[PDB]
């Protein structure tokens, strides 16, 4: 999963 | 073999490192350093094949942090559920944590609480704040510190209030800073850092 | 000021660890090992600011391991030119060692100019192969190679004995020198005491 | 480029 670095959101 | 321990031994003193490291670049706003210490420990802490408990809440701190430095960004995804913001996870994070000093941890929970709603209202999210009070303050009929405040502010649908300059961003900084500050005089003579200074003056 | 060049100091002992960690789990075929380990000190390296001549040494051979492991992967890009491969990548920083100029460094310098060509001649890529060749070339079999490629041979008693294995087994032998020559910096020698 | 491949 995600750990420090975050998702960035995304336009698709 | 012994080859293995010896990896293990080394990879748990690389992460106390950095996390100190991390703590040092948050305390002192250091945003670069921070950024890549952040990267360091990402990467050691993948590599990771083993846990003891101080490895896991040395963890969960780092991790705590890097949601905290984001705060405001809510266009940070820290969870799989899109749609809980930074400070959220934060919040998340801080549950699994230091809850047997629970005068300094309720002070830092109840401020990252006020700014996961006054990040939202400043920005003029409403809906938003609406949204992640439900998910912060459980059964509308149970009492929180500060819920019934925060409700009220809410459904005022103002993007100022009185109360957020009290419970700034700074204030929630600055607090969580102090338990920085902890982590940092317990970390302060971990074998790398202990080490390494020894050097230096010589 | 001073807690800052701790950490320089730390840092450095972190690299010298992470390419011993690097070169063990390259030498054992440990892939998922060596893929964490790779990333962990990329990120150790991508935090330094400054370089002694002896750091810059130690990322060479990580940057050459992490080249030779990609050798195969066709995706694989190291440089900015698009169309240099990751074992010209590999040769590249080869020659960039501050090192013996040495029979194990020729045999090795030579199975990865062969196999830079070979893994292209498993791919059907004979148009790249002679650009690889091209830009590549001066060796004893030069003149075989050459007309190796024209020929399309593939399966020539050349490239089964001066194999892609061949190649491996070469360089996991320099690999072990390296084990030995800094298994004793800093850190993995403190670990080591404490589990002795 | 350093370490990773692109």
Known sequence: ?12 | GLVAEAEAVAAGWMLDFLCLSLCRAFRDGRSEDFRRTRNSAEAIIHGLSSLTACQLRTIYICQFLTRIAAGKTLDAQFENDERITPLESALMIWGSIEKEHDKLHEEIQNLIKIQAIAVCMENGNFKEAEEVFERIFGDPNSHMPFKSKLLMIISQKDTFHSFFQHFSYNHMMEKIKSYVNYVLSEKSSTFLMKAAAKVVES
Not at chain 1, 1 to 12: A, F, G
């Open chain 1, 1 to 12: 999963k995600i750990l420090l670095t975050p998702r960035r959101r995304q336009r698709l």
